[PDB]
Design a protein around this ligand. Sequence first.
Ligand SMILES: O=c1ccn([C@@H]2O[C@H](COP(=O)(O)OP(=O)(O)O)[C@@H](O)[C@H]2O)c(=O)[nH]1
Lengths: 175, 337, 335
Amino acid sequence: KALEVFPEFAAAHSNLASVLQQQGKLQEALMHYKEAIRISPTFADAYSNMGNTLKEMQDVQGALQCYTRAIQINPAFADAHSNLASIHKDSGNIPEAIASYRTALKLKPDFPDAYCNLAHCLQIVCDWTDYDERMKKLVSIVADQLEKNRLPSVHPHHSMLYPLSHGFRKAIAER
Amino acid sequence: FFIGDHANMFPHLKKKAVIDFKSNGHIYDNRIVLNGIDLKAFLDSLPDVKIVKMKCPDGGDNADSSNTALNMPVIPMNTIAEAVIEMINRGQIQITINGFSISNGLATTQINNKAATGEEVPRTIIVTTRSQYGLPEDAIVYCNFNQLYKIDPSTLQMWANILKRVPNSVLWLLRFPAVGEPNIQQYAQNMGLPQNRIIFSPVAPKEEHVRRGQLADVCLDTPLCNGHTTGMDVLWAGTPMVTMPGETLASRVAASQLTCLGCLELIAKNRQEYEDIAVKLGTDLEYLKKVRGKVWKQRISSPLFNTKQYTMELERLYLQMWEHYAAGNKPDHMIKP
Amino acid sequence: RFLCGVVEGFYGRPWVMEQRKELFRRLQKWELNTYLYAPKDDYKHRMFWREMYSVEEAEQLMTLISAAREYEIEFIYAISPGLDITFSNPKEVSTLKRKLDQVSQFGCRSFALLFDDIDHNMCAADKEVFSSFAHAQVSITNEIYQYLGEPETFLFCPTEYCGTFCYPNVSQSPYLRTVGEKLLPGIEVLWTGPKVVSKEIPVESIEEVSKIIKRAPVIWDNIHANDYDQKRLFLGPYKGRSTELIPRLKGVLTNPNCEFEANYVAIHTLATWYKSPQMALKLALTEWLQEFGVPHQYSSRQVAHSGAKASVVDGTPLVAAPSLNATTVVTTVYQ
Ligand SMILES: O=c1ccn([C@@H]2O[C@H](COP(=O)(O)OP(=O)(O)O)[C@@H](O)[C@H]2O)c(=O)[nH]1
């Protein structure tokens, strides 16, 4: 209704594409993101989301360069740093992925999922600096996401490689 | 619940042999070794053969028969022996001696990439040498092959204790990932080990990734998350491993293969006696003989690698699920079938 | 002259003369005709294309044009103006032209203006005086083209170069239409496949892009390139075209990766098989052994394992409604 009423509404395209991504069907979602970008050049959020999809069906690091576009349009957008670092760690280029995670976290002091992913990457390269406190803070944030009770920051596979309660990991798997 | 798969696609590892080492007569098996499906066929081509039975605790019984896979064929050195030694020194890929194709392991990929990964069997006689991965030919080499992330400060302190308490030893690491090796190095000297006490090797295709395990003496294991596939790889080569089961399933995993190995002594209940077992192995210098000989002997007889019994038992378990559920019986703890 | 070569557009300070020298030797001795410089490690001059070169880096450019001379491979310089440029300030156009003259009498004869990865927020005055980014961009593009005496080779990097950015489809791209129209064939446009991972399956897509750009496109061969992925390698023989693509293309410009000689053998397979895939695989096997550079027994990092998958974030925006802003007044409305 909003679109037929206002055939140049950008945020409406964005939300519609978001739910279509939630609907799993993507071609129309990708198209909606595309048209939203056309009608609004500086909509870095739509870059972030369209890259999210564009790697979600299967990786095209065109999603990565899209993340970079969103980055350079406004570097304050930490989520794009997080996503591109995630793509890097998917590729296996762990160091600069760690660098980008570390950046994004220092841009916004408290960002749970990015921080736990960074912790996983660090433990991959075995950087045991701040070890115990890293463990305790990640336990804290996963506990926090567990009684607020939606999606856990730590991935289930990473979970048991941490000292978390069997109840905690059971809850994460359930979630 | 963990199936042995290496009994099929890597049958060439079933046998073992060494040429006469440069050490005067003494048997330090895992420095330069011989393997291959046709290695037995090479026994005739040996101008001088040497056979000594692998004297596991039988007492003259059960072992005086042939037991070709359960002895040592060692060839007293020849001029051709030095030729293949300096082969591995200088590194020509492979040649043929008396119709038997001798190939250095480190480059077997160039024989057949399809056989390199393990899809095809390395197809000729394969010789490997400790020095080709820079290893002290006359030391004690503990090993570990898993990904580097399943190691923590506490476990590093464990193996540093074991290493200090056994000075004449080196620990086998893998630059896997490559970048984390200096990162763990700094931790290694920061608590006081020089840059010689640990030797870290590059990633390889599986067939070499598991063949190189033979050259090590004893495998050190990660209690934080044991090596599921990697540990079993180490088993199939015949090199033993010692672990402390934790509480997570993975922490329990390493002990499962060892229980199927039928020898609890490699399973640890606490950190300190885990230290004790590792050092007892590395210091006895006789107990390695028993453990490795028996693992090599009954690894094939171990109920793990032979997929027959596992296949029938899993099929019977499928019978149990259907004969439980299909009668309307609700799902339950399905125990002692 | 069919363009085929390597771009130093990826990471890297201008390295030793020996590494680049072996590069140029493998270019010339194995028929690679094209080489570019626009590294993402352009120290600061990628955005400060405005910045004059000190005689020191100018003399390293002398070294570069030299090497491109004795090894005869046409070096092309190329810089990105679309980040801090304004299309209504002909002073700044003169800045670009003076820079081009500097590096041109420096020996360079070919240039590309990189309009990718640019700002998208142009001055409003520019917005009404120049309709879209495409129109002002191609206007100054033809301006440079005439200014350099219509150089025979003059590459070009557009703002939209992939399937993602040909809004919304190639057939419906106003930007690309204007690029094709206002351009003259003296400028050679770059474009990287219907997917950024240019697994060039569609010949018909090549025809469509050709006709909407009114020329045979030039493929900025980034499939190897760490400009978007370094580990993405062709394990098998090189691909990304067919025989019928030969007339429909004008150039292939690849960006290599740390497996240097692997990139070399891939591109020379492309060069030979240009003038059928499995013999390149045969040459891949052949020139892998002749390589002996970074063999790793085929088993460098990225070996299979039990890897997890990453997780990613996004939210939803709200909207507002603007109220009235009128501001008018009268004096005598009554009778
Ligand atoms: O140099 C190496 C390192 C690893 N692997 C293989 O990688 C796997 C181990 O990694 P992963 O963590 O996925 O398995 P796990 O260690 O959990 O059993 C096994 O299949 C090994 O054979 C290998 O072949 N060579």
